[PDB]
Design a protein around this nucleic acid. Structure first.
Ligand SMILES: [Mg+2]
Ligand SMILES: [Mg+2]
Ligand SMILES: [Mg+2]
Ligand SMILES: [Mg+2]
Ligand SMILES: [Mg+2]
Ligand SMILES: [Mg+2]
Ligand SMILES: [Mg+2]
Ligand SMILES: [Mg+2]
Ligand SMILES: [Mg+2]
Ligand SMILES: [Mg+2]
Ligand SMILES: [Mg+2]
Ligand SMILES: [Mg+2]
Ligand SMILES: [Mg+2]
Ligand SMILES: [Mg+2]
Ligand SMILES: [Mg+2]
Ligand SMILES: [Mg+2]
Ligand SMILES: [Mg+2]
Ligand SMILES: [Mg+2]
Ligand SMILES: [Mg+2]
Ligand SMILES: [Mg+2]
Ligand SMILES: [Mg+2]
Ligand SMILES: [Mg+2]
Ligand SMILES: [Mg+2]
Ligand SMILES: [Mg+2]
Ligand SMILES: [Mg+2]
Ligand SMILES: [Mg+2]
Ligand SMILES: [Mg+2]
Ligand SMILES: [Mg+2]
Ligand SMILES: [Mg+2]
Ligand SMILES: [Zn+2]
Ligand SMILES: [Zn+2]
Lengths: 93, 127, 97, 202, 214, 91, 25
RNA sequence: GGUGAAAUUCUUGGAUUUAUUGAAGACUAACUACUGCGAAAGCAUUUGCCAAGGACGUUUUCAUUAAUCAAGAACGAAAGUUAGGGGAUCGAAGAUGAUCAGAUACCGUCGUAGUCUUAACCAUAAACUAUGCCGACUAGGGAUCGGGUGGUGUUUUUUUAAUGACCCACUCGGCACCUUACGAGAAAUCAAAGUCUUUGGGUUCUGGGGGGAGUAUGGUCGCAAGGCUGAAACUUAAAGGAAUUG
């Protein structure tokens, strides 16, 4: 029997959604089902500022959206397989 | 406040690249970092080696003389992993601390509008 | 569009289709405007434009062949030229054309 | 007769004598009777006209191109063929173009071509379907048909001649250094076999 | 040792007046030997100088800018414009989920016989009195707005020279004359031009290029 | 009544030469034979003969064209890319 | 064996069966 | 260079890297969501043209014109077939480098077809909500999409409106989600899978233990690959489903 009412993820009423390709194994996966996590990490960070001109003018970072193929997400990223009723919780934390 | 150039850094998995050059980019000053002082063929991306080679990089930088440049660092990109590598930051870590100023920083990683379908087929690498 | 403005005069006023009939009308001055299909030969076209200049009649070049000018006026045959004699209630004589 | 593409009889006035001179061109697809043709450097880029390869922009399609200025046309003359202009070197005033073969040659910008593609294209798409059709085809070109397989003759008539069985008995690839009476088969073949994989030129 | 350090000497750029600060700094191409030298093969480059370094404080620190080297003679290699662009940090920080993006471009020309493809970027602002977390307009607005942005964008790049053009978008008020029309349509926060890129130029006209210094 | 289910005009060749060859011939056959529409007069009066030559029954006009059709795909795509390049040398 | 593999197995099995008797067609 | 690590591989041909710059074909990122549209397949840059559609609104028109449907027909992912063009990418086949006892693979490399497009086929997908269509009734809840109504609601200030966006209440029709269970179910679970042994609103379709087997045979469609239709002899006491404990 089914073990998720969505039986996949976030898709009701369209029949099809062109897929994305996971970052780890390059395996394709429908966009609605690919698990997405936005990586926002800075460049860091104490001596990069002293022996430097521009005494900490901007401090920009890397912004990039990540999609996993889920099995790879399960391997390393946040899947952290849940229990029967605990998986229904959609809280991000 | 002093003379500038261009950083031109690149980060991969199992390799790293770092190289200075004239702002115009026409003339290249000193580039090689990747597996120069490290030779295992596995530690090419390693941060210890990235710094050990970044040392000789800033070395030549001042060997002919320049005070600073702001980065143009990027990841392989294209259609492969969209993200910085291990030996990317570990090089400028020992290069900014090498007595040289830094300024305007930005990424140059190439990214398309969802095209040029990647390798591995729809099932991707299988392991 | 314009095709509708002319499609009104067919069911409203007086017209005449054909090179010969529209030139007797042009020399008689009863024509206030003449429409010439795209594929109408240059010679015939310039000739009509001459008669028009003498009758001080204006002209409009339909962007479409005589086949289109015919189906435009409801007729089931090619039409190389049209000549209006009375625009019953069409604003073609007062529209931008 | 004996040509695939149609020809175009075009009349011109003689600039130095009250006479009419009728030139014979190759009809580029789309040309029609009574049409007006403009020839010269300061001519318009209209299909049918003939302009120097310098007066046209890259990407233009021309036919009956001259290898040298004024040779009265030498390239892209077979039915449905043409050459595309892929560039100009205004210094030495050259002009690089791609021919029907695929090779890219550079010639003087003063060379002339005719805007358009040769008429009668697609002829080769129809199968001949019988020996008689090909017989009539070559009847007007030359006496080159039919062809006897050199392997069906005796050694006195061909290098492949003879043998109790029909076989060339030796490599069918011949060297360019070969002598007349020896060059029969695949001459200077840099390769051989079923050409697999996609192909076009770089 | 070959020691390229002992090799050819540096050279410098400076900006057209067209600004407040102009000193670029310096480059190094080749010593002018005389056979194939630094006379005919130098002014073919561009540099990545930002505007906060070009004119002032960081309220002007996001735009990238190109500078096409035009000509050179003694203590020459002064460079004109080549285009511009934004910077990843700010664009990726402007495109946040729970809102719609609006992007548009047009190719128009100046009396300075240069045409060009401009870009524009606008977003949706959530009125400071609303409860709905997504703040979305709906596709009559998108078409009508990109209609008005092209209407106003193609009425400022041809009513001028490339120089005055620069002097017009530097104050960045272009960003809000777009909002003049938008105010009657949608909130539209974070509105910038975000890029410039180009094809060609009329043959050099050194006399006209020399009209930017003093 | 329908005389042939698939041969059409190619029935003259009988049973010889193979389906493939016959079918591929029938295609160009229909093209080179059918009447087309004249551009200068609007009537369907242009027919072939001497492939690459298309003439209008009335108005006595001839146009150079494809071996089996008035206009060949290539020719058409050239008409377009010649119009664009020309439009680019006046404005 | 897998279902689709059992499919190809018989699909081929029929192609051969069909071939084997078209000889006596 | 590539990986867990290596190797096949590319480098006096200045590779990998930089700069300016041009070509070709494909794709539409981020914005992207429990958000929209279409009969389904399916559909995401811009603009112009072409016809088309639901919901709303309506004291407009017609007046039973309808529901569902054997036969028959339109469309119908991917791959695949015919004729051109295209052929950048990735990439069945095939060839290789490695691993293995073996390794026709998984990992690496080259790369044919293909991938794209036109004209014509082919008509199958876990083409899935594994859940026929029309109608009625039965229950609470806050979101959101579209239309609408209501207003001495906020904001734009121009000088306040008009407007635009926003707030709030209500009402039609959407895509969902949430809580309950009266009730249903073998259970998982279900506002239908409910209003059934207190068994009947209308109508279409399929199934009758498991194998045999979607095999054989005939008919028919297709260029072919194959599609639709579709048995039996014989064999067998289980095969299955949901849930519990291990
Ligand atoms: Mg299971
Ligand atoms: Mg799905
Ligand atoms: Mg589906
Ligand atoms: Mg590959
Ligand atoms: Mg695994
Ligand atoms: Mg003979
Ligand atoms: Mg032969
Ligand atoms: Mg022979
Ligand atoms: Mg013999
Ligand atoms: Mg002999
Ligand atoms: Mg011999
Ligand atoms: Mg022999
Ligand atoms: Mg033989
Ligand atoms: Mg068994
Ligand atoms: Mg036999
Ligand atoms: Mg897009
Ligand atoms: Mg290919
Ligand atoms: Mg293999
Ligand atoms: Mg092996
Ligand atoms: Mg194999
Ligand atoms: Mg089925
Ligand atoms: Mg499903
Ligand atoms: Mg349901
Ligand atoms: Mg079942
Ligand atoms: Mg089914
Ligand atoms: Mg409810
Ligand atoms: Mg209201
Ligand atoms: Mg219960
Ligand atoms: Mg119960
Ligand atoms: Zn993956
Ligand atoms: Zn005619």
């Amino acid at each position: 029997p089914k073990k998720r009412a969505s039986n996949g993820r976030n898709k009701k009423g369209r029949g099809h959604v062109k897929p994305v390709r996971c970052v780890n194994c390059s395996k394709s996966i429908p966009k609605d089902k690919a698990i997405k996590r936005m990586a926002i990490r800075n460049i860091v960070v104490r001596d990069l500022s002293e022996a430097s001109v521009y005494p900490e003018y901007a401090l920009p970072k890397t912004y990039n959206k990540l999609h996993y193929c889920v099995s790879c997400a399960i391997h390393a990223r946040i899947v952290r397989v849940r229990s029967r009723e605990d998986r229904k919780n959609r809280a991000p934390p | 406040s002093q003379v500038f150039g261009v950083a031109r850094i690149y980060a991969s998995f199992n390799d790293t690249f770092v190289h200075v050059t004239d702002l115009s980019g026409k003339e290249t000053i000193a580039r090689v970092t990747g597996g120069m002082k490290v030779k295992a063929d596995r530690d090419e991306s390693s941060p210890y080696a990235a710094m050990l080679a970044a040392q000789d990089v800033a070395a030549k930088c001042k060997e002919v003389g320049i005070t600073a440049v702001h980065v143009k660092i990027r990841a392989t990109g294209g259609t492969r992993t969209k993200t910085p590598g291990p030996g990317g930051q570990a090089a400028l870590r020992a290069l900014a601390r090498s007595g040289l100023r830094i300024g305007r920083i930005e990424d140059v990683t190439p990214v398309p509008s969802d095209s040029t379908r990647k390798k591995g087929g729809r099932r991707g690498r299988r392991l | 569009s314009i095709n509708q403005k002319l499609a009104l005069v067919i069911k409203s006023g007086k017209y005449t289709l054909g090179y010969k009939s529209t030139v007797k009308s042009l020399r008689q001055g009863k024509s206030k405007l003449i429409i010439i299909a795209a594929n109408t030969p240059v010679l015939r076209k310039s000739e009509l434009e001459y008669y028009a200049m003498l009758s001080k009649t204006k002209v409009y070049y339909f962007q479409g062949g005589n086949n289109e000018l015919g189906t435009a006026v409801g007729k089931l045959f090619r039409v190389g030229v049209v000549s209006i004699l009375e625009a019953g209630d069409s604003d073609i004589l007062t529209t931008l054309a | 007769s004996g040509r695939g593409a149609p020809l175009a009889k075009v009349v011109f006035r003689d600039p130095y004598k009250y006479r009419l001179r009728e030139e014979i061109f190759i009809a580029n697809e789309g040309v029609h009777t009574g049409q007006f043709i403009y020839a010269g450097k300061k001519a318009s880029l209209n299909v049918g006209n003939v302009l120097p390869l310098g007066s046209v922009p890259e990407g233009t399609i021309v036919s009956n191109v001259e290898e040298k200025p004024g040779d009265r046309g030498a390239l892209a003359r077979a039915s449905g063929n043409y050459v595309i202009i892929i560039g100009h070197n205004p210094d030495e005033n050259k002009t690089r173009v791609r021919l029907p073969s695929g090779a890219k040659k550079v010639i003087s910008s003063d060379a002339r071509g005719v805007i358009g593609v040769i008429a009668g294209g697609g002829r080769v798409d129809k199968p001949l379907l019988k020996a008689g059709r090909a017989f009539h085809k070559y009847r007007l070109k030359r006496n080159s048909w039919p062809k006897t397989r050199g392997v069906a003759m005796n050694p006195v008539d061909h290098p492949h001649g003879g043998g109790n069985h029909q076989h060339i008995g030796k490599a069918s690839t011949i060297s360019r250094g070969a002598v007349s009476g020896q060059k029969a088969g695949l001459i200077a073949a840099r390769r051989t076999g079923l050409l697999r994989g996609s192909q076009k030129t770089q | 040792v070959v020691d390229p350090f002992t090799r050819k000497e540096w050279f410098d750029i400076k900006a057209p007046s067209t600004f407040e600060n102009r000193n670029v700094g310096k480059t190094l191409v080749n010593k002018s030997t005389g056979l194939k030298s630094a006379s005919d093969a130098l002014k073919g480059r561009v540099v990545e100088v930002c505007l906060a370094d070009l004119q002032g404080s960081e309220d002007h620190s996001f735009r990238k800018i190109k500078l096409r080297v035009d000509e050179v003679q003694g203590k020459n290699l002064l460079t004109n414009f080549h285009g511009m662009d934004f910077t990843t940090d700010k664009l990726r920080s402007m495109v946040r989920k729970w809102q719609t993006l609006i992007e548009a471009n047009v190719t128009v020309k100046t009396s300075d016989d240069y045409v060009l493809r401009i870009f524009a970027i606008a977003f949706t602002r959530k009125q400071a009195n609303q409860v709905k977390r997504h703040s979305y307009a709906q596709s009559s607005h998108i078409r009508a707005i990109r209609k008005v942005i092209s209407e106003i964008l193609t009425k400022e790049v041809q009513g001028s020279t490339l120089a005055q053009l620069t002097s017009k978008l530097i104050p960045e008020v272009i960003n809000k004359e777009i909002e003049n029309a938008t105010k009657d349509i949608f909130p539209l926060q974070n509105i910038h031009v975000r890029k410039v890129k180009l094809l060609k130029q009329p043959k050099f006209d050194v006399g006209a290029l020399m009209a930017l210094h003093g | 009544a329908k005389r042939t289910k698939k041969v059409g005009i190619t029935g003259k060749y009988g049973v010889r030469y193979g389906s493939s060859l016959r079918r591929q011939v029938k295609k160009l056959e229909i093209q080179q034979h059918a009447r087309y529409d004249c551009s200068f007069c609007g009537k369907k009066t242009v027919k072939r003969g001497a492939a690459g030559i298309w003439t209008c029954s009335c108005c006595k006009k001839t146009v150079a064209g494809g071996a089996y059709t008035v206009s060949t795909a290539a020719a058409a795509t050239v008409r377009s890319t010649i119009r664009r390049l020309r439009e680019m040398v006046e404005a | 064996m897998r279902a689709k593999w059992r499919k190809k197995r018989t699909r081929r099995l029929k192609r051969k069966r069909r071939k084997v008797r078209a000889r006596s067609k």
